Amino acid sequence: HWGYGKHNGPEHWHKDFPIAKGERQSPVDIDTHTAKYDPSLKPLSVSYDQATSLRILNNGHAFNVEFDDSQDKAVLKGGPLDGTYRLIQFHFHWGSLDGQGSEHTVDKKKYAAELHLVHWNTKYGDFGKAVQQPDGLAVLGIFLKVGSAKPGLQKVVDVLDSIKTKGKSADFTNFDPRGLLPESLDYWTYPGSLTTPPLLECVTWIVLKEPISVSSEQVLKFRKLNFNGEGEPEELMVDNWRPAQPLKNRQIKASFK
Ligand SMILES: CC1(C)O[C@@H]2[C@@H](CO[C@@]3(COS(N)(=O)=O)OC(C)(C)O[C@@H]23)O1
Ligand SMILES: [Zn+2]
């Protein structure tokens, strides 16, 4: 099945998932001098006070921190969004080295990693229905650079030893995702897709301008994770990012000048 290696990676995905070459694929390079400032965009509203985290899972591609999405406990609204989008999970993509790892790029710059907070449009009732709709998901993307430690990330880093291999999960309750955000909510936005198979074209991308800083020790612990399952030969979980895809017939809007 699919992965990020030479024989099953992004270059191969189109065979099982021909949408890989479709009209609104993600990620993309954000050319900052082509994006259009849109003064009509309302501020982003990130409401995570009642967020209820549940469990963390190594899924053999990255790791998911899952949330209780049975009520409007943690929602994203405003910006380019119509209505209410409920937080369901977050995960990251990262590199083998600090100079690569992000999925989106900014003027061709690759960050060390990228955080994705995934939300679904409540008008569609559940996540599985939402992914079948052109406005089904909103994914909030945040770049990571290596510098000072991110205190709000440490609880995540601390638990990775217990989910080293594919299929392993651990209890991950009472985690506050607000600790993962930068100060500024300035953003770029464009219509795109899931960046992994089945690559469904259901995502409003909201990518924050301001990266968060994480320490070298924090990112190093991400890179000790394994793609393989327990007892199998070790394949380090690194470079689990899809490269930039053609922008095609799309416009990236900016919340800021
Ligand atoms: C851990 C990783 C890489 O991300 C998880 C899961 C399956 O892929 C995802 C990708 O979400 S994304 N990158 O489009 O926000 O698609 C969903 C189903 C949203 O879950 C995401 O594997
Ligand atoms: Zn992702």
Is the CB of residue 61 below 6 angstroms from any atom belonging to ligand 1?
yes
As a whole number of angstroms, the distance between CA 133 and CA 202 comes to 5
| Nearest in space to 144 (alpha carbons), one of 83, 48, 212 | 212
Residue type, 122: T
Resolution to one decimal, Å:
1.8
95 CA to centre of ligand 2 in angstroms:
13
Tokens of 34: 């082509």
Q: Is 214 helix (H, G, I), strand (E, B) or coil?
A: strand
Q: Is 33 annotated as a binding residue?
A: no
89 CA to centre of ligand 2 in angstroms:
10
Residue 207, burial from CB neighbour count under 10 angstroms (0-12, 13-18, 19+)? buried
Q: Taking the alpha carbons of 87, 256, 92, 176 in that order, is the dihedral positive or negative?
A: negative
Tokens of 163: 């989910």
- 153 within 8 A of 217, measured Cβ to Cβ: no
Report CA-CA distances (Å) from 230 to 60, 131, 162.
Answer: 11, 31, 12
Which CATH number goes with the domain that contains 233?
A: 3.10.200.10
DSSP string of 17-74?
-GGGGSTT-S--EE-TTTSEE-TTPPPEEEE-TT--EEEEEE-SSSEEEEE--SSSSS
As a whole number of angstroms, the distance between CA 108 and CA 129 comes to 34
Tokens of 31: 């050319």
Determination method here? X-ray
Q: For residue 167, what is the DSSP state?
A: T
Do you find a cis peptide bond into 191, omega within 30 degrees of 0? no
| Nearest in space to 166 (alpha carbons), one of 227, 123, 110 | 227
Residues with a catalytic annotation lie at 61
- Helix, strand, coil abundance in the chain, percent, nearest 5: 15, 30, 55
Range of the domain at 151: 1-257
- 94 within 8 A of 219, measured Cβ to Cβ: yes
Q: Is 127 helix (H, G, I), strand (E, B) or coil?
A: helix
As a whole number of angstroms, the distance between CA 92 and CA 20 comes to 20
Q: For residue 86, what is the DSSP state?
A: E
Q: For the stretch 55-76, what's the b/e string if a residue is b when 16 or more beta carbons lie within 10 angstroms of its beta carbon?
A: ebbbebbbbbbbbbbeeebbbb
196 CA to centre of ligand 2 in angstroms:
7
As a whole number of angstroms, the distance between CA 171 and CA 152 comes to 17
Is the CB of residue 127 below 6 angstroms from any atom belonging to ligand 1?
no
Question: Given the DSSP bridges, would you call strands 113-121 and 137-146 parallel, antiparallel or unpaired?
Answer: antiparallel
The C-alpha angle 146, 150, 152, rounded to 5 degrees, equals 150
Kindly report the backbone phi and psi dihedral angles of residue 91, in degrees, each rounded to the nearest multiple of 5, phi listed first. -155, 175
Torsion over CA of 186, 192, 197 and 198, rounded to 10 degrees? 130
As a whole number of angstroms, the distance between CA 127 and CA 194 comes to 13
For the chain, what is the total number of helices (H) and then of strands (E)?
4, 15
Tokens of 255: 């919340």
As a whole number of angstroms, the distance between CA 216 and CA 95 comes to 12
Report CA-CA distances (Å) from 78 to 41, 49, 147, 174.
Answer: 8, 17, 31, 26
Q: 113: which strand partners?
A: 94, 144
> Using only C-alpha atoms, what is the Rg of the chain?
17
Torsion over CA of 165, 171, 177 and 180, rounded to 10 degrees? -40
Residue 47, burial from CB neighbour count under 10 angstroms (0-12, 13-18, 19+)? middle
Ligand nearest to the Cα of 114, by number = 2
Helices marked H in 169-223: 216-222
- Which residues, other chains included, contact 176 with Cβ-Cβ below 8 Å and sequence gap of 6+? 48, 51, 152
The domain tally of the chain equals 1
Q: For residue 149, what is the DSSP state?
A: -
Ligand nearest to the Cα of 194, by number = 1
- 246 within 8 A of 254, measured Cβ to Cβ: no
